[PDB]
Swiss-Prot record, chain C:
Chain's role: Hydrolyzes the short-chain alpha-galactosaccharide raffinose.
Induction record: By raffinose.
Coiled-coil zones: none
Protein name: Alpha-galactosidase Mel36A
Catalytic machinery residues: 3 (proton donor)
Family: Belongs to the glycosyl hydrolase 36 family.
Swiss-Prot record, chain D:
Protein name: Alpha-galactosidase Mel36A
Record's keyword terms, sorted: Carbohydrate metabolism, Glycosidase, Hydrolase
Function description: Hydrolyzes the short-chain alpha-galactosaccharide raffinose.
Induction note: By raffinose.
Subunit structure: Homotetramer.
Any Gene Ontology biological process: protein homotetramerization
TM ranges: none
The keyword Nucleus belongs to this UniProt entry's keyword annotation: no
Example of a GO MF term: alpha-galactosidase activity
Annotated source species: Lactobacillus acidophilus (strain ATCC 700396 / NCK56 / N2 / NCFM)
Length: 729, 729, 183, 183
């Protein structure tokens, strides 16, 4: 069906209408990568790697053929100790102290659908016939280890999904010092690389570079996927842009330490690994045990980055996210954090609720400060019980009030964290993650829990169900405000402390899965001081994620633009916040804040009771208009049109039948002598006729995409305009 | 004089007329990097790092101050487990299984001269007073480790030399999983990075790149400094070129596995480590032991890359090389490898000696094939006794014949290597480096010796002195023709197998040092399939090195150009070889091979007896000319003028008093309609008057550097011209 | 120099004008905000600092200024009279071009005893990169007192080390420095 | 007014294009084969293209590298031509634009062109600019005021446009006086 093995020339071919993926069994049972790209009907050996004696690239054991080398062949995988000098995909530590591993082809099987990954988020299928998986097994006969390489192709997607499962069939333990989820080697490709670096309050700007000889590394070891480097990269041709050219995307489905490596070697070849970062990673694999890596989603586009991005959005939204809310319009909420910070009580919050109701908002979210005795960020983490001074009648009483006003109710937690000045720390001080005999380093004056221990998770779990069993909470904002610095797990032997990072993430997933599974009618929004854990693995549990603590309309342009490179727009949230902006002091028009916050799932995060009449009227109009378009903005096909470095940022959504489109154009710097700009649309049907619903003028889809229209000329920095088109009969 | 500590502001200042280097003791005893660059007389706290609370950049143990972080401060050093998220300079494994180290300032001392590095090559002083060394001690009071950071400054050079010595003052062992020789952090610099990648027969092309957010790694783990990536890196301004702009050069004095890391972080700062590669590196440091790293040479130029390169040339030549030959003109020799390969006997070689004498050559080097039963490269490594079939009366009989013809005699060895097909292997099979139980991988159908074992080194040492004590050998070419792939040392415990790479190099150095020390009157030429081990460390033992097995005049332009970026031209050798070229098939003029080969130390490597009469005449003239100019070409100050991607490559040497200059200009591709080009000189005295010794015309130095001269126009590819100027009274 | 009197677009106009023409040849006025030609909003102090690069003037209805703006004018005028000999006639060095997100320049009197430096930041950032400003045109062996802080630095320090620019929130912000050689 | 031909130079060209309310941004380009023309025929030297050009090495910046500056001393139509030819040589003309220029020169008459100032810097654009500043200020400008501090003036144009009378201007004058303005 989708996957065939030609036993004549030892070539595996994964194939659908859009893509072909070819790999083969070369000399020494070496698994060789041939091709990933546009579909071909057949293969006829034209990509067999040329034989050449290359100085200092050595050969297979006992071989006299100097023209074949594992140091030059493009491959599907690699290891330390096989006469390869590229950065290896896997590294094993053997009882004799060596790091040797020499993998050779053993067998394969082809099966329908794709197997569940134990303890990890993963992509899946609705019907078994919609995908197939190839599992190629390699073995080292001396250490008796077997590596299963998994490859999944979906029938209807330009996607290959890969991961690795290691098995110890020997009599002694080994340690896994590194296990990449995949490796891909290219020949005669002159790619550029695109990644999404950033910082707190500055996530995921698009960065794009040449690849020189050596290794470029994009990674995190913060215990999280991180603000500073998203687990994603794309390889593109020099000329690829948003609308044309080839692109290969690689998204790692994992929310902890990642490592993407892009190496160009001495023969001009590009070698790529992705998976769990090997930094302090050393997994003890006992006899008869197995280790499963997270998976990587790989997308090929033959036609620009929007098309690449759209394939990620569709896969994530349709075959990764489990939430019952994933296909449901998301509520327009007010969140009180920037509005009040810690300085509030119930009565203060009730006036905000009352104002939210008059403005037509749909949900009120209670943010940090409701619990323990949290008056500031120096205490109380670990004590998930209401702070009575602020809620004298309990939380249920406030929740009832919110519901009474026609609003849903949301609540913030930070389940992974603990403060010295908490009841939790006084009763269970060993729950705090640290190295015994060493003072731990603080970050935001708090510390991290040992989520690798069941007892620790059970305690936090029980605290939480005590609040959530009332079913008065409709939504949970799950936050996480520091990286891991003191890496240890107190109940493991010394020789297993290389497991602490990954066991932390497994425990996080386990606790999280337990809560979203127990409360399927709760909308969970992920958060980590903004977008510090914004990845495909997280999507599996939370259908939306706070993109950034930076709520400036202008800096949000670059953050939402970069985020959309991988993640569907319904997965990121965006709030209208006060001006001057609280993080950078920028002054922006209220209407621009609105229009930028409608790209993600719209909400409000400012003190609504302090808005002028004029601002309130604008909120009324924004919310009324958003309710009419949000099915299209939240779930339509997304096209990036213009990137902010150009002084304009523009994007649009089109519904799946191309009958309706919503376009936004934002101008950054004003100029006294402005150049005329045009905006051209994308993704319309050239033979439909579209009415501009503001002006009632009608335009062929062909006109909107080829002619476009003039952006209106106006004075003032930071101005936006929106357009709404609908196909007529 | 050169080093001061201000104990009130806690600032160390190393200073001479050219450079200043500033570092301070910051909060928490954190050693902070302030500045390295043009000299300043005083310092007044203006570079104190700004305090800002940065999200997810955590703080010191027990500190309430969030505006200071080891994750944002620029530093002299760093480690895993100190709340820093950059790639760490050092990583330690403790008995409790953790990788935590927390270093804090302990004390300093300032000494004259600089201390010897045990078991390693290093720079040194002739008079104590020409340099001073600052040693800053940092400690971790829990593990009781102490790290000594050494900083040496020479009075008359724009150089800082750095290394690290780790001491275990606790009661239990630790393991060192990484120990960088140096770290340097920069603020608000938008550098490009230059490196010297290549391949076998394609070494050290200049590569130049932008630095994006993430980590760029330039490294080797071939057990040698390598063909693929030289242990060198420079950081430069975007507008820096050969003649102007700032440049920072870093050369690691080490001939094993290296790793240069250049990270640009989330706050736009650039973070650099250099040292021994941490790949499979794990050094067990028992109580009361120490570990010394190789040193790094750092050069600052405020005026282009020529001036940076010249500071390295001068340091290497005057204060690193130890050979009695280092200041002596190098012989014009013939080497028979490309002339005959393996297919020769004594009588064939004698005709070549005879022709060499007629042509005025000064030395004959007997290359591979003279020993064991070496008829091809499938046997005999490890059997260093003459091959009686080829030398029926012994090696001394041939050596004597060479001397009778008035030439010196050189001999090739590959002391680090072993063939299965050898007496060495038959008698001592366990000398062969391999993981017990695993067939080793072959490369050039040979294997590596366990140089980490005294027994093994002594065996080879004794074989070699038996030949060399005859006093009949004036020169040794020391070759090494494959990388290390099966990494183990049979006499170490399993938990010390992470010492195998570094013990191998230490053993190599130990054997090499012993031999060069016993034979001060022998000229040693290093080699490793060409330039696979061309580094500052090797220079300490061998004053010249075979630059590449590529002997094509045109590809050698790029190899020699990139080589000269760090290494004095007297350290590289270059031979006129046959056309068509044996490696790439290019056809070049005999004159062009001559001119390109006089940049390095000139030699011939082709069957002299087969040359036409016209070529013999060219050789006679080349050799007669070279003897006149070679004091200037071999030891004069070097200036690169034009790089070959321009279609021209040009360079010149000027003697120390600027009275004599030799210039070479090579045109690569001809054109039917050629543009006129000019060549301008550099490094002359503008107020001297220089006679062109071919034409007798006289030009002011100012004219030669400002006006230059037209290059002659000719047809034909791959043509060269040389000029020789001398100052007149 | 231009009918455009926006402090921010004036950075590029004044920068390109100075490529050829002495600064005393161009005039620059403090004008109202929002700017009348492009609608940009800028701090009053930034308009002052950019308008002192050329020969300073005011072009706005002085009778409509708030008391706070009038005090700023009094202070701008008082400061400008002290320094204008150097800013109008000192040797001009451009230091930073606005596309870098900063525009900076400085004037040094003919004996290198006095210098006036201006640094203007265009876009604010939530997560700002530290920047330094290095001076040019000073005597490396003179010692120069910052007249605001009273701290003293060698000419060599000010040109090779420079100093950290202060980190502030808000778009379109300026800082000036006045150095004078001491005995 | 002049012509300059270069051999084996791989210059970039800097010019000062703009528009009304947007004059003299720095622009910097490669020179390909063909002719690049920078000019005015507005009867003035113009907002759109200042009569100035510099040729610089690729690595030249504000502080280092060679630069050649060419300023045409003329306030009418100019034309700067930078031609790179079929043999890689660079040919430059500067003078009065020839566009609808046709001057009848009778027997025994003469025609004098405006002059071009050419500056060579061996050390960056600041140094080039400083030489233009010094020449223009000391050897071109004739005005008695050229060496005198320039007055801090208020100009009423953006303050009132056309809508004023004397009484209104007098209130602005009074306020200007309180603020310490001089004209």
């Amino acid at each position: 069906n989708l996957i065939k093995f030609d036993d004549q020339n030892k070539v595996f071919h994964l194939h659908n209408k859009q893509i072909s993926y070819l790999l083969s069994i070369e000399d020494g049972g070496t698994l060789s990568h041939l091709y990933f790209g546009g579909a071909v009907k057949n293969y006829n050996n034209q990509l067999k790697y040329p034989r050449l004696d290359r100085g200092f690239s050595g050969n297979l054991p006992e071989s006299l053929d100097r023209t074949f080398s594992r140091d030059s062949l493009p491959k599907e995988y690699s290891s330390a100790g096989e006469m390869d000098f590229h950065t290896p995909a896997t590294i094993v530590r053997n009882p004799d102290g060596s790091n040797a591993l020499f993998l050779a082809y053993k067998s394969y099987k082809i099966e329908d659908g794709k197997p569940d990954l134990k303890g990890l988020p993963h992509s899946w299928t609705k019907e078994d016939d919609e995908a197939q998986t190839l599992i190629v097994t390699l073995e080292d006969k001396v250490s008796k280890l077997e590596y299963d390489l998994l490859y999944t192709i979906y029938r209807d997607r330009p996607v290959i999904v890969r991961s690795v499962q290691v098995h110890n069939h020997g009599e002694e333990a080994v340690y896994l010092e590194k296990v990449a989820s995949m490796q891909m080697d290219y020949v005669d490709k002159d790619f550029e690389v695109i990644t999404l670096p950033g910082a707190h309050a500055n996530e995921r700007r698009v960065q794009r570079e040449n690849i020189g000889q050596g290794i470029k590394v994009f990674s995190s070891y913060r215990g999280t996927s991180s603000h500073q480097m998203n687990p994603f990269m794309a390889l593109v041709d020099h000329d690829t842009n948003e609308f044309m050219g080839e692109a290969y995307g690689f998204a790692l489905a994992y929310s902890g330490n990642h490592k993407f490596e892009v190496e160009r070697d001495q023969f001009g070849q590009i070698h790529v690994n992705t998976g769990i970062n090997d930094y302090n990673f050393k997994w003890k694999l006992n006899p008869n045990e197995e280790f499963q890596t997270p998976e990587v989603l790989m997308v090929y586009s033959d036609q620009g980055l929007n098309k690449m991005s759209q394939a990620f959005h569709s896969l994530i939204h349709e075959r990764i996210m489990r939430s019952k809310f994933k296909d449901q319009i998301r509520p327009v909420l007010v969140n009180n954090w920037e509005a009040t910070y810690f300085d509030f009580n119930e009565d203060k919050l009730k006036t905000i609720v009352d104002k939210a109701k008059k403005l037509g908002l749909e949900m009120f979210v209670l943010d940090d400060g409701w619990f323990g005795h949290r008056d500031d960020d120096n205490s109380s983490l670990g004590d998930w019980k209401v702070y009575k001074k602020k809620f004298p009648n309990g939380l249920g009483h406030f929740a009832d009030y919110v519901h009474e006003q026609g609003l849903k109710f949301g609540l913030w937690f930070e389940p992974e964290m603990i403060s010295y000045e908490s009841n939790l720390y006084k009763e269970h001080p060993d729950y705090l993650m640290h190295v015994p005999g060493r003072k731990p380093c603080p970050s935001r004056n708090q510390y991290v829990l040992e989520l690798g221990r069941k007892e620790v998770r059970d305690n936090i779990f029980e605290q939480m169900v005590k609040i959530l069993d009332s079913k008065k909470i409709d939504y949970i904002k799950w936050d996480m405000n520091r990286s891991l610095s003191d890496i240890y797990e107190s109940d493991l032997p010394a020789d297993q402390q290389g497991e602490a990072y990954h066991r932390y993430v497994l425990g996080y997933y386990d606790l999280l899965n337990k809560l979203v599974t127990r409360y399927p009618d709760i909308l969970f929004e992920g958060c980590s001081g903004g977008g510090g854990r914004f990845d495909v693995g997280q999507a599996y549990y939370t259908p939306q994620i706070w993109a950034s603590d930076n709520t400036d309309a202008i800096e949000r342009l670059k953050i939402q633009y970069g985020t959309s490179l991988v993640y569907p727009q319904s997965m990121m949230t965006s709030h209208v916040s006060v001006s001057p902006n609280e993080q950078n002091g920028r002054i922006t028009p209220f209407n621009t804040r609105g229009a930028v916050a409608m790209w993600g799932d719209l909400g409000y995060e400012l003190d609504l009771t302090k808005m002028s009449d004029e601002e309130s009227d604008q909120v009324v109009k924004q919310v009324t208009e958003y309710k009419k378009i949000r099915e299209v903005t939240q779930f339509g096909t997304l096209y990036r049109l213009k990137a902010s470095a150009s002084n304009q940022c523009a994007w649009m959504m089109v519904d799946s039948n191309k009958n309706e489109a919503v376009v936004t154009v934002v101008n950054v710097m004003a100029h006294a002598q402005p150049y005329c700009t045009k905006t051209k649309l994308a993704g319309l049907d050239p033979d439909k006729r579209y009415k501009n619903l503001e002006t009632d003028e009608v335009f062929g889809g062909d006109e909107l995409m080829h002619l476009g229209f003039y952006d209106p000329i106006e004075r003032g920095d930071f101005k936006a305009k929106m357009y709404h088109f609908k196909a007529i009969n």
